[PDB]
Design a protein around this ligand. Structure first.
Ligand code: GTP
Ligand code: GTP
Ligand code: GTP
Lengths: 427, 50, 41, 50, 62, 438, 438
């Protein structure tokens, strides 16, 4: 049977997966202690795609958590579901990262790659047949970028026939907090695009705008932000696990999603987001779902594809729907903005419908997008890189670590290539 | 690169060489240092006699 | 006064020895039970 | 600015120099290997073709 | 009779050594083939570059 | 784990160490006896104190600091004080001969027979430590004993320990007030000796500290206690990240990497925004906006430098208490939109934020306010060159007329070392405009 | 079984044994009368005393030692002491005429007619013993009567008994303090005589013994009783293996085999780590690591030798009390991997660990610490030759100007034996660097 092994990386990821895992557990009805409360038979069958069996009806998460700072792990262990996670899965080092990619990518990783490789292959041998792996991290994260870039490389030759699903959050364009973050972002993406097959792009600022727009709660938690992104990922995972006539395989999706190898970076999209009175003021109809599903405000990933055009689009619908309404809505939007798609390919729509609604709402959906809205992203990092590489600011550490400017030369040069590649394909 | 064959480091040899030099010179100035204190004390003592 | 609602407590994974606890302990205590277990409440 | 770095022998900062002085030769070997990795990898590629 | 000979004492030198020219079994015979192809050193079966906090030359205790 | 060792050198630098350790025991509630109530916090020395105190199962919290001084007057009085039972006797390293403001006297004459014994304390403290991220060095540039001794000490601790961090805290010389005329002498002597080994030197000046007192704290006649309390709050705030947690936890390693641009210059500036009297905070309100305007208000800095006469490089804010990043990143975004604030074009981003949930607390018999939102603003700017620019013309005149030299050369120096420092200074200022030049 | 005999020569060597046997009676609960209480421990003399005392059917614990002096002053007073009923009257071998610091007078004039008496004691003690591993020789190099008399008898007990161990303990002459200027004469006389006959000679110097007292014990005003207590504690620690057991039990035979590398040189250095004032360990903690650091701290040795000026060959550590191998092996692993400790490359390992569960107990009216983890650090290094190097330049002058020779040539000695010892000594040094030279 085809299952998935999860990787819990980066300190933001340390907040990510913890929320992501509890979203899964609460969906399935397992108590915080771990003894599953048998309530749904369909979830009783298909839980094994992510969880194995411990003694006494306890479903062990098949995730691996890695860090260097114990306190985050201690907070994670003191989380509502730290008991369901295994101390065996808690691999770490006895050092501080300094938010340094090179130390993580060359110094601190070296003595940790051995143990984490043993842990995953132990977990890999624990399961029978995997679709692939998914990795929660960030491109702007000091330890996450250093670890992930190493981890993605080694598993490439280890299992070159699986799914290398990835999770990175784009740091806030207005402020990166970390000033060497553009260095870390530029370094990580070079190995990323080479090694990765899939990438979801997420930015915090849009979520902050989403909080301003529909949440309307003024002072939320980053965990509430985790709640949203976990909900987005939980929805796309519902495809494999739930029944219903929707084709779920990521490879099925990816071949429908990736026309050319250099296309890994994709944007999420989500379904009904509702404010105080509108929960009791909304007529829950597929038309208004589709309108809200395709709203320029409804996006959360990077920026408005209004500036560019649409290459490949795919939305998965979760709940009690039918093929005709999604069909006519697809025609309606096709007639709505026909020119905004590329003349390169028509009928770029990919539809899957999950008949099993979530617990709390009935009509729901998720959208995955590949438009020409990433240029603003990597062009932005370009002037940052050129300005700081103009006079090698904050560089003596990396030479002190053992890094040379030559590595930066192709890193930006490879980045410059994809600027034209996205430009040349669309423009 | 301890896998590729041929990656021995003469770095330690140069580092060891530098340490050896510093130790030798240490002996030199120390012998010089001990002599001058003795000389001064006699010179000061001769002043007392004068 | 003397609020421990926010304060941190022992680290289970940093130091692994009997020189934190009191009383008879055979194993290390791997558990979600903390003195600060009421933060969620 | 007078020229000063000739030879003498005292080196107040020398470990750091040695570390970087070794940083080039270690990087030198990698560039050559990737050239051979380039030819061999594609060689198999179209070999599997026919 | 050939005798072991080694260098002086240091403070940073590791005690032990691995020397995977003969400590890899994935690619052993290959690196074994290039042992004489370069002709660096085979000699005694048992040569380590770090006995304990001590170093020597390439020629193993000969 | 997460712990550090504090260093306090000079009789002026030990009463400050008293206050912070007085301050530190309050939030931990350490009784003057040295033990907790029947409440369970003692063990093998592992709790909120384990990063600062060593409370062995004997129940006695042993602070991780060493007070070194050469005049037994003050150190014996505090040995007769209130917490002297907590303080280890020979950790309170006393001496019997002063340096008479002479750096070299404190660097050559007596430090030789004293550096050996403190190093035994250091290693006997280092061995019991586990994580030992770095050191907290408390001193003064115009040190009658602070200057000379620590210099040899910071050298000797650097040569054996050059891999860990060393944090240096010293009162900056008063730009227009001089309690000593040899004070410039050792000051440049200290700077040139430290620039190649000191990791991060953070400075402060008492005059503007006094200026704040009667500006917003409204005390026309404070005392050292208030001066000591406010600096003790500063180090308390930066150490809260070790003490507590927050939205994100940061460390001095991140501080160093993100503060200092380039080697040599490692001299940023601190500031605490919510400095105000108790009654004012009572009938007014505190929020991120006004304090952000306040912390960037030029007259709120303790160092006599106009930011508009220089340019910004880094600014590190450490928000302690109840905050949400929503207004935080929004408020600082407005700060980025501000045009008077002139960061160098080299850095689009220069802001390092640290969030801690724990509200800053008042001290019994205190003068501060009931703080909920607080921030420590560590920044580095080019407007500091005037300070050394002030020093060199102060120095060059005195060195040309070579006053008091009979004192120094009398006990065994020569003019080469005094010569070296001035082009080291000349290299220092010439560096400042070159990096200032874009 | 596991028993031995102690010998006390020189007027210094008897008050030290008194305190040792004073200490020895406490751990067995020996009442000064000579008997145990109604508790059932008396019998055929076979119990914890059988290795130390002879508590025969009479019920009186007879110490297994013979005290020999030549001046009735001290021996009569102890014959009027508190435990004189315990001590056998003629085991307290007294004399009426002194040696006047003269080795030869104590070796020729009077020793002939007295050794037959003490030899009778030896054999009459030899017959009653069963295992009789060896002897405990307490003496002094600057022996007013220790020098000459011990040398003759140790020759006599060597020739008849050459199959068992002989353990020698003498106060090493003070390197810069001399209470006798003829002390160099007999001291080198004693050394050259003993080199080919003494099995294991262990030394001590009182200056650093005093130095310890006001360093950590904080006793600026100690006494011989205190000095006798610590050496009595020292010999007690090495004999605890005979008294009690532990994880492993070790014997002088293992000590001899594993400590002496090569012939002649059998002069290691003992050291006891947990030497601290009670109030200092009151609010502090002692564990294996720091006492290991303390025991290897150079100033904690009682012999004026810098280990960094020499190199290590052997080290014997004897943990008496509660320990676990886990920290013991880990700590020494840190110690073995320490840079400053320069062992000779010839020895991969040089560590002989002794574990005894019994905690060292205090003495009533004492001054020592309160130790659960105690270690006696016996070690041999090359930093010792300086003492003999110090000795020879003193002797070479005074012999060349042949002072006090009229005294020795007056009583029948002459210069040749003096000549012999110098190249015998010169042999000792010239052996010391070549073993140092790898
Ligand atoms: N956990 C967490 N991370 C955040 C949050 N907001 C932003 N982040 C960012 O998410 C990034 C990814 O975290 P990691 O990959 O674990 O970073 P790291 O390698 O541990 O090193 P740093 O980036 O310095 O934290 C961090 O660099 C943060 O800048 C937040 O609210 N919670
Ligand atoms: N660090 C510190 N400095 C103070 C304090 N109070 C006043 N000062 C200033 O700091 C300077 C102290 O320097 P020194 O006088 O050289 O102190 P010292 O080196 O320990 O030796 P002394 O001359 O004996 O005091 C004084 O000149 C004051 O101007 C204080 O509490 N702490
Ligand atoms: N170990 C030890 N040595 C002592 C003691 N008291 C003094 N000493 C020193 O050890 C030396 C003992 O040698 P001697 O003075 O010849 O003693 P003696 O041979 O027993 O007989 P006398 O000539 O009467 O003193 C003295 O010179 C003292 O310097 C003591 O109580 N114990």
């Amino acid at each position: 049977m085809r299952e998935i092994v999860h990787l819990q990386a980066g300190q933001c990821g340390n907040q990510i997966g913890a929320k992501f895992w509890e979203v899964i557990s609460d969906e399935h009805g397992i108590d915080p202690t771990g003894t599953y409360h048998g309530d749904s038979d369909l979830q009783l069958e298909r839980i094994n795609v992510y969880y194995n069996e411990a003694t006494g009806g306890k479903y062990v998460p098949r995730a691996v958590l890695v860090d260097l700072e114990p306190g985050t792990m201690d907070s994670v262990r003191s989380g509502p579901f730290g008991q369901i996670f295994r101390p065996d899965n808690f691999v770490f080092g006895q050092s501080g990262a300094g938010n340094n990619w090179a130390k993580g990518h060359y110094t601190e990783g070296a003595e940790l790659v051995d143990s984490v490789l043993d842990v995953v292959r132990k977990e890999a041998e624990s399961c029978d047949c995997l679709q692939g792996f998914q990795l929660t991290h960030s491109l702007g994260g000091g330890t996450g970028s250093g670890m992930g870039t190493l981890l993605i490389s080694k598993i490439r030759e280890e299992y070159p026939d699986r799914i290398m699903n990835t999770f990175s959050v784009v740091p806030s364009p207005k402020v990166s907090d970390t000033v060497v973050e553009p260095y870390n972002a530029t370094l990580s993406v070079h190995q990323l695009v080479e090694n990765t097959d899939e990438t979801y792009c997420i930015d915090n600022e849009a979520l902050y705008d989403i909080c301003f727009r529909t949440l309307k709660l003024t002072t939320p938690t980053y965990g509430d932000l985790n709640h949203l992104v976990s909900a987005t990922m939980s929805g796309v995972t519902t495809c494999l696990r739930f029944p219903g006539q929707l084709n779920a395989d990521l490879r099925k999706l990816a071949v429908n999603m990736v026309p050319f190898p250099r296309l890994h970076f994709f944007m999420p999209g989500f379904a009904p987001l509702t404010s105080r009175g509108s929960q009791q003021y909304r007529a829950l109809t597929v038309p208004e779902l589709t309108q809200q599903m395709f709203d320029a405000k409804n996006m959360m990933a990077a920026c408005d594809p209004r500036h560019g055009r649409y290459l490949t689009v795919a939305a998965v619908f979760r709940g009690r729907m039918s093929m005709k309404e999604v069909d006519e809505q697809m025609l309606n939007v096709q007639n709505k903005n026909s020119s905004y798609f590329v003349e390169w390919i028509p009928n770029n729509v990919k539809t899957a419908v999950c008949d099993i609604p979530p617990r709390g709402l009935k009509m729901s959906a998720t959208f995955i997008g590949n438009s020409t809205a990433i240029q603003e992203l990597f062009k932005r990092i370009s002037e940052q890189f050129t300005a700081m590489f103009r006079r090698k600011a904050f560089l003596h550490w990396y030479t002190g670590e053992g890094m040379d400017e030559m590595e930066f030369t192709e890193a930006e040069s490879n980045m410059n290539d994809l600027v034209s590649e996205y430009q040349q394909y669309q423009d | 690169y301890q896998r590729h064959v041929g990656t021995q480091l003469p770095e330690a040899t140069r580092l060891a060489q530098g340490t050896d030099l510093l130790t030798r010179h240490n002996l030199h100035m120390e012998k010089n240092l001990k002599e001058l204190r003795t000389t001064h004390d006699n010179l000061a003592w001769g002043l007392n006699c004068k | 006064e003397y609020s421990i609602v926010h304060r941190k407590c022992r680290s289970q994974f940093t130091d692994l020895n009997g020189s934190k606890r009191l009383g008879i302990n055979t194993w290390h205590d791997e558990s979600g039970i903390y003195a600060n277990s009421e933060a969620k409440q | 600015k007078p020229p000063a770095w000739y030879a003498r022998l005292p080196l107040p900062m020398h470990r750091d120099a040695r570390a970087q002085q070794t940083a080039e030769v270690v990087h030198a070997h990698a560039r050559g290997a990737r050239l051979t990795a380039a030819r061999l990898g594609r060689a198999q590629h179209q070999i599997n073709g026919q | 009779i050939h005798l072991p000979r080694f260098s002086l004492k240091q403070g940073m030198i590791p005690t032990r050594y691995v020397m995977p020219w003969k400590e890899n079994m994935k690619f052993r015979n290959v690196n074994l083939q290039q042992a004489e192809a370069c002709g660096i050193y085979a000699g005694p079966l048992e040569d380590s570059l770090f006995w304990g906090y001590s170093e020597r030359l390439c020629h193993g205790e000969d | 784990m997460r712990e550090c060792i504090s260093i306090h050198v000079g009789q002026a630098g030990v009463q400050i160490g008293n206050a912070c350790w007085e301050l530190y025991c309050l939030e931990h509630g350490i009784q003057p006896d040295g033990q907790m109530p029947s409440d369970k916090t003692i063990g093998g020395g592992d709790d909120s104190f384990n990063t600062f105190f060593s409370e062995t199962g004997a129940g006695k919290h042993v602070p991780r600091a060493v007070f070194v001084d050469l005049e037994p007057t003050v150190v014996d009085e505090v040995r007769t004080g209130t917490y002297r039972q907590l303080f280890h006797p020979e950790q309170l390293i006393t001496g019997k001969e002063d340096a008479a403001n002479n750096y070299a006297r404190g660097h050559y004459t007596i430090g030789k027979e004293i550096v050996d014994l403190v190093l035994d304390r250091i290693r006997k403290l280092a061995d019991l430590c586990t994580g030992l991220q770095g050191f907290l060095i408390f001193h003064s540039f115009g040190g009658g004993t602070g200057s000379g001794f620590a210099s040899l000490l910071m050298e000797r601790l650097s040569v054996d320990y050059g891999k860990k961090s060393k944090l240096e805290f010293a009162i900056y010389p008063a730009p227009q007030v001089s309690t000593a005329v040899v004070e410039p002498y050792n000051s440049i002597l200290t700077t040139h000796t430290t620039l190649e080994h000191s990791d991060c030197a953070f400075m402060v000046d008492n005059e503007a500290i006094y200026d704040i007192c009667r500006r917003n704290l409204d005390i026309e006649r404070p005392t050292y206690t208030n001066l000591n309390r406010l600096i003790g709050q500063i180090v308390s705030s930066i150490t809260a990240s070790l003490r507590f947690d927050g939205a994100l936890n940061v460390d001095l390693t991140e501080f160093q990497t993100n503060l200092v641009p380039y080697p040599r210059i490692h001299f940023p500036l601190a500031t605490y925004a919510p400095v105000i009297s108790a009654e004012k905070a009572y009938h007014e309100q505190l929020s991120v906006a006004e304090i952000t305007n306040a912390c960037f208000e030029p007259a709120n800095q303790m160092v006599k430098c106009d930011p508009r006469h220089g340019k910004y490089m880094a600014c590190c804010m450490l928000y302690r208490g109840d905050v949400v990043p929503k207004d935080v990143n929004a408020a600082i975004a407005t700060i980025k939109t501000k045009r008077t604030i002139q960061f160098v074009d080299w850095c689009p981003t220069g802001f390092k934020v640290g969030i801690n949930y724990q509200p800053p607390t008042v001290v019994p018999g205190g003068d501060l306010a009931k703080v909920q939102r607080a921030v420590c603003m560590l920044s580095n700017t080019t407007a500091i060159a005037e300070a050394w620019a002030r020093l060199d013309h102060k120095f060059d005149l005195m060195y040309a007329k070579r006053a008091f030299v009979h004192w120094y050369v009398g006990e065994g120096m020569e003019e080469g070392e005094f010569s070296e420092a001035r082009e080291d200074l000349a290299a220092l200022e010439k560096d400042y405009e070159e990096v200032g030049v874009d």
